[PDB]
From a paper:
Among the >600 human ubiquitin ligases, UBR4 plays a particularly important PQC role, being an essential and conserved E3/E4 ligase found across eukaryotes. Aside from teaming up with various ubiquitin ligases, UBR4 activity is linked to two specific cofactors: calcium-binding protein calmodulin (CALM1) and KCMF1 (13, 16, 17, 20, 21). Our data show that the evolutionarily conserved UBR4 complex forms a megadalton E4 arena, in which inward-facing ZZ-DZB domains of KCMF1 act not as E3 ligases but as substrate receptors. The architecture of the E4 megacomplex is conserved across eukaryotes, but species-specific adaptations allow UBR4 to perform its precisely tuned quality-control function in diverse cellular environments.
Focused cryo-EM classification and refinement yielded density maps that resolved all folded regions of the human UBR4 complex (HsUBR42/KCMF12/CALM12), except the flexible C-terminal extension bearing the catalytic hemi-RING E3 module. The structural motifs that constitute the ring-like scaffold of the E4 complex were well defined by EM density, but the functional domains lining the inner cavity or extending outward into the periphery displayed high flexibility, as reflected by their lower local resolution. A second appendix protrudes from the C-terminal dimerization region, where a zinc finger domain positions another beta-sandwich (BS2) and two associated zinc fingers near the central cavity. Finally, an extension formed by the C-terminal Armadillo repeats projects outwards from the UBR4 arena. This extension houses a ubiquitin-like (UBL) domain and a flexibly tethered hemi-RING module, the catalytic E4 domain, which was unresolved in the EM map.
Author numbering:
A (entry chain F): 8 to 24, 28 to 58, 62 to 77, 83 to 129, 133 to 146
B (entry chain C), E (entry chain D): 289 to 331
C (entry chain A): 3463 to 3647, 3684 to 3775, 3788 to 3982
D (entry chain B): 3983 to 4078, 4087 to 4344, 4469 to 4501
F (entry chain B): 3463 to 3539
């Protein structure tokens, strides 16, 4: 059922019968609301300038635990198994968002020892 | 004059009616004068 | 507005005939609902603000800035009058014993008085004949073909020596060209008619040695179109209709254009900014607004109305021709049985019911409806039980709220009279009205030290209170 | 001055305070002024400092808004809530390559959004709103307001300004298309709205996106309803409407513009053909209250039908089947529409020149059983002169 | 021109000042746009 | 109206020359009292309603409906 809608959308967006330039717009047309970073990452994943209907189907399939573990590992930048609050501040600065050090402390406090274990991260998700 | 409804106002009064209206008007005038005078009394 | 007599008759019959309480209540509810709906419609008219503001400043004849032409409000009743025949002369042709004339435009003649001056007994027309044609022709000589270019109206035998004869058409005839012949019986241009030795008038000059004839008609100008008889006539009519539609669109766009300038001028006037410099003593903005509205808007409205009337006439004629052709085709079909129509069905299907309404959002039409409603309510108030029922319906609040101030001075006086009558002896109603008046007055007086306009906007309430006190 | 926040609060309070009022005086006197002030505020004056003298207005932003969330709490700011400071909004917004770096960034962004949501749910972090607008709002009343065309223009400008981020433009075009239904109600006074839509629909990609929403069916249904209303009116009375045909012509033009997309034509040309044919027939029937705008709409519809009437052999067969079905819809006593119907059909079957392979279309007609309908129509003929 | 108080109108700004004012204006416009969008959200 | 130059000079001197906070407060009180008194007088003027209403309609040259002729107003240069 969904495959039919995807094929119809691919045909519609296919100008000459698709380019990655409107690929994000295709997802927006399908009802999915993507983030610009997510779109850029998907484009990097796929276009190793035009994709095939099977390629778009595969991309949508990845859109419809391992990622959680990878994110947790990324959080432990020092890899000490403990995600440092200072590491969290460095990550947020990399993200460009500005937040209070007290805000980071409160967030970690909301996260016994207050040290985010892998179990703690999983429970957060 | 073709408008029939125009002739609606048909008031009339007896001579006794006029006299009674005069007496009522006099009583009303007296009451009004008394009330107005009360409005100017010394506090 | 044409339904005044209907309103009068309805009021008289309703007041005279005794009726059930439920019937009275239903009638009251219907009337109140009609009045409330009309008031709500008027209160939100798109042009309401502009028209209301303009009303107080310049003496305005009509609301000449409506979108769709209010046909009922647009069709005045011009009366026929005696006008000289020579006045409308456009094309002139003269023959041995007949004269062909074209009018400046179509008109509906009722009777024509023809005087015979400089009469000579040698040749006196024992009779005359008339013919009329409402078909547009270019040249007087072009209509020399007698039968097709004439439709005889009446032949009247004139006694010898009679000068002024008033040939009266049994019904008014609408036409564009006429041919009048001295049916029974050059000196000016020296055009010696070798053909006619002694004609009634010169075949070229119309120099009439027998006599001279002057004519006039108790007529009113009429707008119409020549009858459409051929399919070629149908095509010509379609083309004319399209052209008229285009011209009307241009005129309507032009007329609607004046609106923004009028709005800007109204804004400037509302500022009421004092300025220094009695024919020109008025505010320059006021004079400019008067010139714009009274001068330009009125002229544009008139032109658009004329165009719309012509377009309606053409559409009616085309519909008539098409319906006649369709009916003829149905009659030719033997299988097709002729449908006899009941009188109501015939009237409904007839083209008679086509032009008897104004525009839907016609501010003037709504105002007329409101005025008629006010008159009807004032009448219906006479029955004391009806008065109590209406007060139960709570008309007083609506009357004070909406209809109290708007409308003409006579409308305001009538509304005040009706309001006074409604509280003729109802103590509760009198208390309610007095409470409303006192509340408005006190609310105004609270900001009195700050708003001169507040003091300026209490005249109507005070007049109403004075009138109420006036009726013992 | 420094009273920017307070003055803005007062102004917005006034604007939202009387936005629902419909009286012409109130709209003219209060709503117009507030709208003009807001328009002046939203679009600032052009940059003057030489460094950004030519820089885009959107470029000079010191922050970047959330991609799919609006962090502002309008009710709170109106309530002069302490947490609803402009400085608060500034603090909440983010400031203004290896493939593994990109993947890490995306994962970090997703995890950060999730963590912020969890902190909001469990703790006291506020909840930013989501980009979903209601079908009933001040914009709907304001845009098609019949009080003043200047107010409509100002609202159009404000709305055009409101659509800067593509994510915003998505919901913006959604709401605009949703509001399109009222076009017939205000045939003339809504001209600005159309002007806005056509302006915003200039992007071909946005055009395809709107097409994906299935707007074509809504447009066709609206066109059919308008044609039906017009036919009923022309059949009913003989009144003259100077504005007759504005909505119809506008809708026809919009439909043609949407159809200009070649890929869209390849997509759903067949689905719309029948509506086009029925409309062309009905317009050809319209003879009483015929407007110049109506004539132009009819011409545009005929041109669109002809353009759509050019494709593959299967496409020609589909067009023939559609014609046969429409003729089945035509009444037997009717003797005008079948003329043009069969004329176009014949022109298509054997191409009129300006073994019977050129007549293979006839076999398609037999397949459609149109020959039976042809015999039935032939039976319907009774008067030789009349037909 | 004799009125000295008339000539008092005399503002000045640096290029950096103009740039900062432009940036503040842009930020304010963004905040206004967001607030206005919030005024039409679905309920 | 002849004190226009005097007013401009007084304003320039007051703005340019520094003064004590008490002096500023006194000058402010004086000016405010003058303005308030003038406004109160104008508001309670006898012909105030008539002149005000007439202002918005026709181009008025002068208030030609005063009882005592104001010598300053009635002596043009």
């Amino acid at each position: 059922e969904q495959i039919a809608e995807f094929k119809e959308a691919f045909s519609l967006f296919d100008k000459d019968g698709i380019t990655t330039k409107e690929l994000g717009t295709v997802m927006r047309s399908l009802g999915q609301n993507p983030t610009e970073a997510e779109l850029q990452d998907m484009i990097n994943e796929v276009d190793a300038g035009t994709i095939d209907f099977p390629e778009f189907l595969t991309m949508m399939a990845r859109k419809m635990e391992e990622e959680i573990r990878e994110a947790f590992r990324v959080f432990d930048k020092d890899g000490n198994g403990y995600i440092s609050a200072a590491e969290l501040r460095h990550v947020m600065t990399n993200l460009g968002e500005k937040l209070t050090d007290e805000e980071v402390d409160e967030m970690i406090r909301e996260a016994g020892d207050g040290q985010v274990n892998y179990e703690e991260f999983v429970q957060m998700m | 004059s073709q408008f029939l409804l125009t002739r609606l106002n048909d008031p009339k009064m007896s001579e006794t009616e006029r006299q009674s209206m005069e007496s009522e008007r006099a009583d009303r005038s007296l009451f009004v004068q008394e009330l107005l005078l009360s409005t100017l009394v010394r506090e | 507005r044409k339904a005044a007599q209907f309103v009068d008759l309805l009021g008289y019959f309703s007041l005279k005939t005794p009726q059930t309480e439920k019937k009275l209540k239903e009638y009251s509810q219907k009337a109140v609902e009609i009045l409330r709906t009309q008031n709500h419609i008027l209160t939100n008219h798109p042009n309401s603000n502009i028209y209301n503001t303009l009303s107080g400043l310049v003496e305005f004849d009509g609301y000449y800035l409506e979108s769709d032409p209010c046909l009922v409000c647009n069709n005045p009743e011009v009366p026929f009058c005696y006008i000289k025949l020579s006045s409308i002369k456009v094309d002139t042709r003269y023959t041995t014993t007949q004269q062909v004339v074209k009018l400046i435009g179509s008109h509906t003649i009722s009777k024509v008085t023809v005087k015979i001056g400089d009469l000579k007994r040698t040749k006196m027309v024992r009779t005359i004949n008339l013919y009329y044609n409402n078909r547009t022709v270019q040249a007087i000589v072009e209509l020399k073909n007698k039968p097709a270019r004439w439709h005889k109206a009446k032949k009247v035998q004139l006694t010898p020596g009679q000068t002024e004869v008033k040939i009266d058409l049994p019904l008014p005839i609408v036409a564009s060209n006429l041919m009048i012949e001295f049916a029974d019986f050059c000196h000016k241009c020296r055009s010696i008619n070798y053909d006619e030795k002694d004609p009634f008038l010169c075949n070229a000059c119309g120099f009439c040695k027998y006599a001279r004839f002057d004519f006039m008609l108790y007529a009113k100008p009429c707008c119409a179109v020549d009858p459409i008889e051929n399919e070629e006539d149908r095509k010509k009519a379609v083309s004319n209709i399209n052209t008229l539609l285009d011209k009307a669109d241009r005129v309507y766009h032009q007329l609607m254009g004046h609106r923004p300038q009028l709005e800007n001028l109204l804004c400037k006037v509302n500022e009421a900014a004092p300025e220094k410099p009695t024919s020109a003593s008025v505010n320059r903005y006021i004079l400019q607004l008067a010139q714009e509205y009274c001068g330009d808007c009125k002229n544009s409205f008139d032109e658009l109305s004329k165009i719309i009337q012509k377009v309606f006439a053409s559409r009616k004629e085309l519909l008539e021709y098409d319906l006649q052709q369709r009916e003829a085709a149905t009659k030719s079909s033997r299988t097709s049985v002729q449908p006899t129509f009941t009188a109501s069905q015939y009237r409904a299907l007839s083209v008679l019911g086509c032009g008897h309404t104004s525009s839907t959002k016609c501010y003037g039409c709504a105002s007329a409806v409101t005025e008629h409603c006010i008159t009807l309510l004032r009448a219906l108030a006479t029955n004391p039980a009806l008065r109590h029922i209406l007060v139960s319906q709570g008309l007083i609040r609506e009357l004070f709220d909406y209809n109290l101030r708007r409308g003409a001075a006579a409308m305001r006086e009538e509304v005040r009279q009706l309001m006074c009558l409604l509280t003729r002896d109802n103590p509760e109603a009198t208390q309610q009205m007095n409470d409303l008046i006192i509340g408005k007055v006190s609310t105004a007086l609270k900001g009195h030290w700050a708003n001169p306009d507040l003091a300026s906007s209490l005249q109507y309430e005070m007049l109403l209170l004075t009138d109420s006190i006036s009726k013992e | 001055d420094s009273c920017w926040e307070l003055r803005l609060r007062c102004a917005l309070s006034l604007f939202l305070m009387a936005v629902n009022i419909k009286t012409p005086v109130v709209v003219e006197n209060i709503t117009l002024m507030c709208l003009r002030i807001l328009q002046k505020l939203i679009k600032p004056p052009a940059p003057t400092s030489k460094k950004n003298k030519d820089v885009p207005v959107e470029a000079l932003t010191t922050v970047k808004p959330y991609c799919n969330e609006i962090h502002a709490q309008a009710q709170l700011w109106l309530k002069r809530d302490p947490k609803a400071s402009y400085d608060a909004w500034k603090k909440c917004l983010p400031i203004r390559p290896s493939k593994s770096e990109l993947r890490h960034l995306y994962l970090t962004e997703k995890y950060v959004w999730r963590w912020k949501q969890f902190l909001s749910r469990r703790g006291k972090r506020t909840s930013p709103l989501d980009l979903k607008l209601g079908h009933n709002n001040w914009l709907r009343q304001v845009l098609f307001t019949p009080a003043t065309q200047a107010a409509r223009q100002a609202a159009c400008t404000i709305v055009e300004a409101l659509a800067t981020i593509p994510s915003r433009k998505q919901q913006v075009l959604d709401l605009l298309t949703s509001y399109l239904d009222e076009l017939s109600i205000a045939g003339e006074c809504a001209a600005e709205y159309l002007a806005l839509y056509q302006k915003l629909i200039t992007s071909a990609h946005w055009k395809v996106y709107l097409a994906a929403r299935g707007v074509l069916p809504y447009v066709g249904n609206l066109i059919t309803k308008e044609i039906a209303r017009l036919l009923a009116l022309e059949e009913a009375t003989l009144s003259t409407d100077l504005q007759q045909g504005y909505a119809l012509k506008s809708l026809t033009g919009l439909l043609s513009s949407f159809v200009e997309v070649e890929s869209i034509k390849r997509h759903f040309k067949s689905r719309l053909v029948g509506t086009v044919l029925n409309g062309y027939l009905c317009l050809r029937k319209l003879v009483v209250q015929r407007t110049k705008l109506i004539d132009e709409t009819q011409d545009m519809l005929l041109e669109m039908l002809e353009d759509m009437t050019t494709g593959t052999e299967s496409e020609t067969k589909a067009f023939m089947a559609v014609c046969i079905e429409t003729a089945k819809r035509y009444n037997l006593d009717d003797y005008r529409t079948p003329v043009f119907i069969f004329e176009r059909l014949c022109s298509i079957i054997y191409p009129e020149e300006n073994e019977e392979e050129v007549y293979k279309m006839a076999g398609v007609m037999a397949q459609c059983g149109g020959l039976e309908c042809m015999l039935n129509r032939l039976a319907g003929i009774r008067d030789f002169k009349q037909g």
